[PDB]
Amino acid sequence: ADCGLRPLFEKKSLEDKTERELLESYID
Amino acid sequence: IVEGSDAEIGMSPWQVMLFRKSPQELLCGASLISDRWVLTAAHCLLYPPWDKNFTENDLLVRIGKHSRTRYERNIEKISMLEKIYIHPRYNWRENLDRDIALMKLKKPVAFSDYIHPVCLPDRETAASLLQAGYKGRVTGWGNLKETGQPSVLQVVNLPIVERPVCKDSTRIRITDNMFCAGYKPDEGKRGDACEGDSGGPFVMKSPFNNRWYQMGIVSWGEGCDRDGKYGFYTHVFRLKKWIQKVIDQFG
Amino acid sequence: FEEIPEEYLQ
Ligand SMILES: *[C@@H]1O[C@H](CO)[C@@H](O)[C@H](O)[C@H]1NC(C)=O
Ligand code: NA
Ligand code: NA
After folding, report:
1. Do domains B1-12+118-237 and B13-117+238-250 have the same CATH topology?
2. Is B131 exposed, middle or buried (CB count within 10 Å of its CB: 0-12, 13-18, 19+)?
3. What is the DSSP string of A1-28?
4. What are phi and psi of A13, to 5 degrees?
5. Homologous superfamily of the B1-12+118-237 domain (CATH)
6. I want to staple B113 with a disulfide (CB 3.0 to 4.6 A). Which of A1, A7, B107, B228 is the partner?
7. Best of B46, B51, B53 for a ligand 1 pocket test (most atoms within 8 Å of beta carbon)
8. What distance separates the 2 farthest-apart alpha carbons in chain C?
9. Which DSSP category does B97 fall into?
10. Cis (ω within 30 of 0) for the bond into B207?
């Protein structure tokens, strides 16, 4: 149920240095 | 990983190192999909042309790692294998079609800041995200160049490539159980998986629910980071019925 | 590679 949510990132609402590059590519 | 960067701490807490006991060395990457199950490429375990056919007792799984070569005391956890399951239609003879394997651990691994499972995609998430131009992320401790080795886990983000471009880049027969990713020569940016990254994950962060999904497994490539070549990845969703069958039957 | 604890190799 908790898959894919990282303790040091999503669980604490911190973003890693390059995840925004992925989001920007998701153009739908 | 060629033309990547050092991972952040806890950036890829599902990353697994497959570690040969004797001689002690990196065999492959892998990923954590539950407290007892690890996903990798079949060719990491079985590849007769190279006289490769590992049994459970040959290998260990190292989870929570960051450093390649260090024993990361109080951070990594080391698990023994109960059983390996290779896809029954893995095609080692020809083109590595269905390049997927599961490993069940002897005991559950404890989750931590450094150890946490990745999600496997549903049909809808796969349909939404597996589109040309959409980027995923590949991680591993493999070679830094085709022809050295990193101190810590490497990461690179790479775009999914249109199927005709994938097919036209190679003489190998490409199947629906594969996809390819990487930049085109005219795109400037670079990067690829390389030897030692096999079996590791290609992940995407769903913009719908904030979760990371493993869409691919590092499968094969012709050299590493060559202009006009692309990395090929096992299409996890296409093989998910097999994954579920194995987990349902064997726990 | 740094040696790992012997407990994992038994
Ligand atoms: C791999 O090893 C097992 C024995 O541990 C053997 O039964 C099997 O036939 C081998 N498979 C191939 C393709 O060599
Ligand atoms: Na071709
Ligand atoms: Na390339």
Report:
1. yes
2. middle
3. --TT--TTTGGGT---SSHHHHHHH---
4. 50, 45
5. Trypsin-like serine proteases (2.40.10.10)
6. A7
7. B53
8. 18
9. B
10. no
Q: How far apart are CA B27 and CA B32, in angstroms?
A: 16
Residue whose C-alpha is closest to residue B117's, from B205, B209, B33: B33
How remote is the CA of residue B217 from the centroid of ligand 2, in Å? 21
Backbone φ and ψ for B18, nearest 5 degrees, come out as -90, 125
Contact B4, B155 (CB under 8 A): yes
Nearest residue to B235 (alpha-carbon basis) of B183, B194, B182, B174? B174
DSSP state of B129: H
Atom of ligand 1 nearest to the CA of B92: 13
What element of type H or E holds B137? strand B135-140
Domain boundaries, chain B: 1-12+118-237, 13-117+238-250
Which CATH architecture fits B13-117+238-250?
A: Beta Barrel (2.40)
Is B30 within 8 Å of B39 (Cβ atoms)? Answer: yes
Of the candidates B13, B20, B21, which has an alpha carbon nearest to the alpha carbon of residue B214?
B13
Which helix (H) or strand (E) segment holds residue B232: the answer is strand B231-235
Distance B96 CA to ligand 3 centre (A): 19
**DSSP-assigned beta bridge partners for residue B79:** B61
For each of the domains in chain A, give its residue range(s) and CATH number, in order of start: 1-28 (4.10.140.10)
CB contact under 8 A, A22 and B13: no
Strand partners, B136: B158
